[PDB]
Amino acid sequence: PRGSHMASMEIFGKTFREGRFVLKEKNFTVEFAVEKIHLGWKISGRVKGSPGRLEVLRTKAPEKVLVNNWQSWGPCRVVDAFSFKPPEIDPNWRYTASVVPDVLERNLQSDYFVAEEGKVYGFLSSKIAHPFFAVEDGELVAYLEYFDVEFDDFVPLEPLVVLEDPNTPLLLEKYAELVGMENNARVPKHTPTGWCSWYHYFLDLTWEETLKNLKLAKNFPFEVFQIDDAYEKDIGDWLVTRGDFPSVEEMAKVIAENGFIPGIWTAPFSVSETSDVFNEHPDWVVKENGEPKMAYRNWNKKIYALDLSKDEVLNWLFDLFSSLRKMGYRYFKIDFLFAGAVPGERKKNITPIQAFRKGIETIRKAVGEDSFILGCGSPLLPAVGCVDGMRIGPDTAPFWGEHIEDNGAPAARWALRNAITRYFMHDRFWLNDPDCLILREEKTDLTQKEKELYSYTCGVLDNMIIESDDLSLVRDHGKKVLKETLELLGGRPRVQNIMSEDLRYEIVSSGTLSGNVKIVVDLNSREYHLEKE
Ligand SMILES: OC[C@@]12C[C@@H]1[C@H](O)[C@H](O)[C@@H](O)[C@H]2O
Ligand SMILES: [Mg+2]
């Protein structure tokens, strides 16, 4: 039998049932199939014309839903769908909140997937359209947004799955396995360890301080030595240094001379209003009414988005990342990637998602198969198959964040929450990056118990482990936490109670380097209890 709830769903406006169907509307045509798969149903097919904001599924909204923001920093969390209040959106960061901000300013929005107890609805890809859900007058509606682009000939729909089982974590894991297959996900066999400058030195990093850490890093179990934001003269001018830094090429040569894999931060789809590249090439950016469209404001400057539909832009990206590879960099943290997918006017009439994918594909080609790509500030689904690792929460911080709301400002407590709630993408989409461990004992307000809680959770989850500290300031305790963390890697994790609303989670991982383990963590009390077999 079906189920009363399944007879009550609509697929492309028709009553739900298994079959093969054609919708011919005024401005578009859809051909689609509704087919049985393990644990549920798959809706797939093809579309042509001007589909616009295309309705795919409609069903009664659940009371409590696990919602997901489209990008690295945005929350994945359980919300009450009936008492939802639209947020005030910061005009300087509009597009990190939503790629369709008209939705978010009036209704609850979830990107790519949404879950309730016993049921996952999820799209398998975002190659052309942006897939998202909205709660509109008590109804859950799935959409594919094509951003007013027209298609003369058929292109594939992003597939939708509807999965049901009482084990919600199992469904999220299955969903993510299907996403990995649809997109030829990269799941490296080896996970890098390393050092990152950001969460000690921030923009005030000097090359003198960098060299001091490079010598000390020889006593710590680090493979990668990554320079973050600070070295560059302006956003977009990635090969021009400032302050006491040598050349970008010389930085690589010192780092490699000292026995590390050189790593470097860029924001490659972003160019500031002051940069040489923007002032040389005003034509290279996404536009609004013919003029440069602000993508976001950061570093106290307007930042514009590179128009990734333009071959001149893609050639510049190729040559940049080719040059970096020639210098010896083999670890690339590529940040603020949402900029490349902002809605706006481009040279070619392609979607922002199509443009985005051309840009990241160009970066991968340039750095080669032997380079590690870490995505950050990024749309998640469009990057599967391209990146090796991906930041999946908001920034951590050398403090827990007692007065920081769940709003995107840095805080260890909210960074950790996302590592938990997105755990199922790990070893399926890519390697999850939970953000850096901060293990120093001076110049921090983190307690030893908070450092433990953060680090051991990241280990049980088998996530990337990168440390970000002035290494002078890390002593016995910080060293022991890093050692014991690395002992918890290598397993298959599950968060058992993924729909929890009180920030206490039970987490198991099978087959770690320490055997079967279990950690119960409480992000309100700041406590954990870890058992290892
Ligand atoms: O600017 C470097 C910086 C702060 C911005 C971003 O929030 C990223 O997620 C951080 O790890 C840093 O690389
Ligand atoms: Mg693994």
UniProtKB/Swiss-Prot annotation:
Highest taxon listed in the record's lineage: Bacteria
Regulation of activity: Inhibited by hydrolysis product alpha-galactopyranose and to a lesser extent by beta-galactopyranose, its mutarotational product. Inhibited by synthetic cyclopropyl carbasugars.
Record annotation: effect of changing residue 410 to D: Increased transglycosylating activity at high concentrations of p-nitrophenyl-alpha-D-galactopyranoside substrate, which could be useful in industry and medicine for the synthesis of different p-nitrophenyl-digalactosides
Record field: catalytic activity: Hydrolysis of terminal, non-reducing alpha-D-galactose residues in alpha-D-galactosides, including galactose oligosaccharides, galactomannans and galactolipids
Reported effect, residue 335 to A: Less than 1% of the wild-type enzyme activity with p-nitrophenyl-alpha-D-galactopyranoside as substrate at 80 degrees Celsius
Outcome (variant: residue 395 to A): Less than 1% of the wild-type enzyme activity with p-nitrophenyl-alpha-D-galactopyranoside as substrate at 80 degrees Celsius
Effect of pH on activity: Optimum pH is 5.0-5.5 when using synthetic substrate p-nitrophenyl-alpha-D-galactopyranoside.
Gene Ontology terms for molecular function: alpha-galactosidase activity; carbohydrate binding; protein homodimerization activity
Top-level EC class: hydrolase
EC number: 3.2.1.22
Keywords: Carbohydrate metabolism, Glycosidase, Hydrolase
Temperature-dependent activity: Optimum temperature is 90-95 degrees Celsius when using synthetic substrate p-nitrophenyl-alpha-D-galactopyranoside. The half-life of thermoinactivation is 6.5 h at 85 degrees Celsius.
Active site: 335, 395
Residues that bind substrate: 73, 199, 228-229, 333-335, 376, 391
GO biological process: carbohydrate metabolic process; glycoside catabolic process
Pfam families associated with the record: GalA_N (PF22676), Melibiase (PF02065)
Function: Hydrolyzes the short-chain alpha-galactosaccharides raffinose, melibiose and stachyose.
Family: Belongs to the glycosyl hydrolase 36 family.
Alphabetical list of PANTHER family matching this protein: ALPHA-GALACTOSIDASE C-RELATED, GLYCOSIDASE FAMILY 31
Subunit structure: Homodimer.
Listed name of the protein: Alpha-galactosidase
Natural source organism: Thermotoga maritima (strain ATCC 43589 / DSM 3109 / JCM 10099 / NBRC 100826 / MSB8)
Gene name of the encoded protein: galA
